[PDB]
Amino acid sequence: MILDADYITEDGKPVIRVFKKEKGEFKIDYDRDFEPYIYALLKDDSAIEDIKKITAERHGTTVRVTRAERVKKKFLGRPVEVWKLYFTHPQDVPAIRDKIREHPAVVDIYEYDIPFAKRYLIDRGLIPMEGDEELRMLAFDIETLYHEGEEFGEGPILMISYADEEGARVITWKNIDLPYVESVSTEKEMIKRFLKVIQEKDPDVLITYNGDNFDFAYLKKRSEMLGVKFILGRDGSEPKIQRMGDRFAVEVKGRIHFDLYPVIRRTINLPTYTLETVYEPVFGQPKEKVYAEEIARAWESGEGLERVARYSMEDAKATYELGKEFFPMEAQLSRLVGQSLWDVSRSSTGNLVEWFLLRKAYERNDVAPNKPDERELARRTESYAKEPEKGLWENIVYLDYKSLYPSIIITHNVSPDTLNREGCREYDVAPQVGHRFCKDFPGFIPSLLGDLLEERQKVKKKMKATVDPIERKLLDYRQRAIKILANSYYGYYAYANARWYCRECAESVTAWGRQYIETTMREIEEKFGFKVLYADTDGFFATIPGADAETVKNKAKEFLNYINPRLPGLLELEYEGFYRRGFFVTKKKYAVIDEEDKITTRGLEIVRRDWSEIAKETQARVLEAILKHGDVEEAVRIVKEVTEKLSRHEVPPEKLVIYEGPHVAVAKRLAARGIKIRPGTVISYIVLKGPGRVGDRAIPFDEFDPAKHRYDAEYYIENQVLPAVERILRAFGYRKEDLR
């Protein structure tokens, strides 16, 4: 199994290194014979003898064109000739290319910014992560003493923990009694201990959380002074700290540094992500955080410390198992796309599509377009972008659309190379946007999308016919990845930095989308007696007013296999679900309840950061009276009861606690217990009645006596409780005033 590729240089020449892991042992294939190159379109062949003499310099030495050969290719569905120019070292390219294209006989130059090792993987047709191999993985984390007045680097490494299928321990230079900790002389001897560990297990994959921006940039700095050589690469080098966007990323030769942060900030959507945050949504339960306890352990020798140890092995374990959760999808994405997991786990879907197109382009001898320069990219930033029935309804079906966009792309053959072509004998016309797409031949993108979809279907048959749990799981992920990629083409067409950019294609796919949803919703109403209540870009909610639940489910099935044989191409409507009751507020706000009594809402619940218990309980009760019981007036009543108790200081002070000027206040009775507070802390308080603004006197929930402190009743009624139900009831005709 190919893990990755890079290159080094001897006496001015590149040498490719492919890191493999096959049948138990690590291997390194070297290749001294690959050559860098680019392309050029010349106004007349006679100019090459001029171009072969252009020159530049690097490291004080002269750089030239090695060889030049005339070649036949395809550019946007039009045959054409170009010259392939070779060189000696890949870095020669960045230093001589500009000159070559500012020559008069040059229309343009192509494929001059494809990194050498990826160029190699694509041209030699090698595909990383392809086998059936078992890779040893292992995570690790460090803990450093907070030195208030920072100077990033200053302050030893208190702890460092790792995690493997074989347990999970912690190593330290202090004394601590626990069946899983380790104590040694100094931090230096700690760091040497750490290195000796990895050297022993020799992991193929190292897992971390934000390891690209903290953990490696620390173990390093505080090692240049402890006088130790932080060696981890199977080649004996130190981790290579590179630069991606405006932040950084770290690489470890021979291995694979998997940083969860990027993936998670893309696979799971949350308001504020955090190791303990993201750990709960993945599979069940909590962990603990926000310490200033490091300060306590620093001042006392005894303990507090023995608790902080737990924190560590926990970061370490919570890390090893989340990584074990997102590795499969990222590995299949790598195999599907043709690039390493290091790069794939750190890129956007837009880039995944690009890397996929460049490979196919080479495969089919299609020359690639260039990325946008400052101005082109400047233009490409001018963006592109009915009402729901009102009231309470019942016996509702939701009809889903299967692959809407990629479906339209294939059916109408929408591609940059088929756009408004001259002399086209057969073509389709884009709805309101009159663009003509030629059908005299298959379009570049369309063909590839078509091949992808039927591929997914062959994997599904295989997944439904295999009986082994391990193969079934593998085929399942491979199957989902084709889906993620396929549903990314539409967005790609409108991606400013995209090589195969096409605004006429995007607007068109969007226009056809509305025509199809329009005609489908018209059929079901005029020929089957339904009434559409809400519509999305894809599916829609509908029902037959005053009919039995089974009468609606069955009538909807009759509709499906009546409209599909009538729909062109691969598009289909698919039964999705049934709901007993629901109401739709605006273009993206609604609430529904399934038969099992489960309630779902979109854009209605608390998006706050300062929510409280009593505010969350009341909104839930309002939604239950309406959806589970179909009683609007009962909801309205429930909201008055609550504001009444809360106005008569009767509400149990427990449900009033909140997490994260009022803050400036909490920082006082806290800075009293000698507890300092900076940006990453725990702020749990309760609002009280005070001599100033209605929401500025609060104190830690600790300091609370049912006879020394009362609670600011109006803060809860106005800032919190009402704005948690106002929008829902505003849809049934009520206002703020009918709630107090």
Catalog residues that contact Mg ion under the rule CB under 5 A: 141, 143, 312, 315
Q: Residue 406 class from Cβ within 10 Å (0-12 exposed, 13-18 middle, 19+ buried)? A: buried
Any residues with CB less than 8 A from the CB of 400 and at least 6 apart, and which? 538, 539, 573, 574, 575, 576
Nearest to 161 by CA among 322, 313, 321: 313
What is the per-residue DSSP string for 654-719? GGG-EE--HHHHHTTSSTTTT----TT---EEEEB--SSSTT--EEESSS--TTT--B-HHIIIII
Residue nearest to Mg ion (CB): 315
CB of 295 to Mg ion, least distance (A): 16
Cross-strand partners of 30:
17
Which CB sits closer to Mg ion, 141 or 164?
A: 141
Q: Residue 18 class from Cβ within 10 Å (0-12 exposed, 13-18 middle, 19+ buried)? A: buried
> Cβ–Cβ contacts within 10 Å for residue 214, how many?
16
| CB contact at 8 A, 83 and 70 | yes
| CB contact at 8 A, 702 and 675 | no
CB of 352 to Mg ion, least distance (A): 28
Which CB sits closer to Mg ion, 215 or 330?
A: 215
Give, in order, the Cα–Cα distances in Å from 17 to each of 11, 87, 118, 127, 232. 17, 19, 12, 14, 17
Which CB sits closer to Mg ion, 91 or 210?
A: 210
Read off the tokens for 664.
Answer: 């400036």
| CB contact at 8 A, 164 and 320 | yes
- Residue 578's SS3 state is strand
CB of 209 to Mg ion, least distance (A): 6
CB of 580 to Mg ion, least distance (A): 46
CB of 309 to Mg ion, least distance (A): 10
Which CB sits closer to Mg ion, 318 or 486?
A: 318
Nearest to 403 by CA among 273, 550, 572: 572
Read off the tokens for 141.
Answer: 């984390």
Which CB sits closer to Mg ion, 288 or 471?
A: 288
Nearest to 699 by CA among 655, 721, 726, 667: 667
Strand ordering across the sheet containing 157-163: 181-183, 170-172, 157-163, 137-144, 205-208, 256-259
How far is it, in rounded angstroms, from Cα 555 to Cα 574?
A: 14
> What is the torsion angle, in degrees rounded to the nearest 10, for the CA atoms of residue 607, residue 611, residue 615 and residue 618?
50
SS3 sequence of 496-562: CCCCCCCHHHHHHHHHHHHHHHHHHHHHHHHHHCCEEEEECCCCEEEECCCCCHHHHHHHHHHHHHH
Which CB sits closer to Mg ion, 194 or 540?
A: 194
Read off the tokens for 565.
Answer: 């044989």
Which CB sits closer to Mg ion, 312 or 351?
A: 312
* 315 labelled binding-site residue: yes
Which CB sits closer to Mg ion, 16 or 309?
A: 309
Number of alpha helices (DSSP H) and beta strands (DSSP E) in the chain? 24, 28
What is the pairing mode between strands 79-86 and 106-110?
unpaired
Read off the tokens for 58.
Answer: 């690097």
Which CB sits closer to Mg ion, 249 or 361?
A: 249
Which CB sits closer to Mg ion, 6 or 259?
A: 259
Computed on alpha carbons and rounded to an integer, the radius of gyration of the chain in Å comes to 31
> Cβ–Cβ contacts within 10 Å for residue 524, how many?
23
> Cβ–Cβ contacts within 10 Å for residue 588, how many?
12
CB of 143 to Mg ion, least distance (A): 5
Which CB sits closer to Mg ion, 158 or 481?
A: 158
* 141 labelled binding-site residue: yes
Which CB sits closer to Mg ion, 111 or 215?
A: 215
Handedness of CA 181, 182, 185, 186 (dihedral sign): negative
How far is it, in rounded angstroms, from Cα 517 to Cα 520?
A: 5
Return the ∠ at Cα 267 (arms to 468 and 467), rounded to 5°: 5
Which CB sits closer to Mg ion, 308 or 336?
A: 308
Which CB sits closer to Mg ion, 287 or 380?
A: 287
* 29 labelled binding-site residue: no
CB of 559 to Mg ion, least distance (A): 54
CB of 215 to Mg ion, least distance (A): 6
**Would you list which residues are annotated within the binding site for Mg(2+)?**
141, 143, 315
**Would you list which residues are annotated within the binding site?**
141, 143, 315
